Design a protein around this ligand. Structure first.
Ligand code: 8TY
Length: 121
């Protein structure tokens, strides 16, 4: 049907926008602290702490799977990366401080991105 393809063309180019956003979010993580899931081999008790782990690699797989149906779902995943980190790691750790910076520096990018989405519908 002509309805699903035009729709697809939106879901597909929502995807296109969010990939752009994601690459900008990740550049705010130069040390690549959030690039990959926390190693369960290196932190075996991790899941006893964090019930919904998240990282940039995992977001990217969902992104390419066209798994984000809107910007809200995407931001939820971004938030998980930051909030997990600020619970698991103490305040005076390179980890915690890295999540604070990412959250602060990320906010303007998400600010823009929210304005583009409602714009192009
Ligand atoms: C995301 C997070 O909280 N990290 C702290 C633990 N480190 S680790 C296993 O020591 O390299 C990975 C990043």
């Amino acid at each position: 049907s002509m309805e699903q393809v035009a729709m697809e063309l939106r879901l597909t180019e929502l995807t296109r926008l969010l990939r752009s956003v994601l690459d900008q979010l990740q550049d705010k993580d130069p040390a690549r602290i959030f690039a990959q899931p926390v190693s369960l081999k290196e932190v075996p008790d991790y899941l006893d702490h964090i019930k919904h782990p998240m990282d940039f690699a995992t977001m990217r797989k969902r992104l390419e799977a066209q798994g984000y149906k809107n910007l809200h779902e995407f931001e939820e995943d971004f938030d998980l990366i930051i909030d997990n980190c600020m619970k698991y790691n103490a305040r005076d750790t390179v980890f915690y401080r890295a999540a604070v910076r990412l959250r602060d520096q990320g906010g303007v990018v998400l600010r823009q991105a929210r304005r583009e989405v409602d714009s192009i519908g």
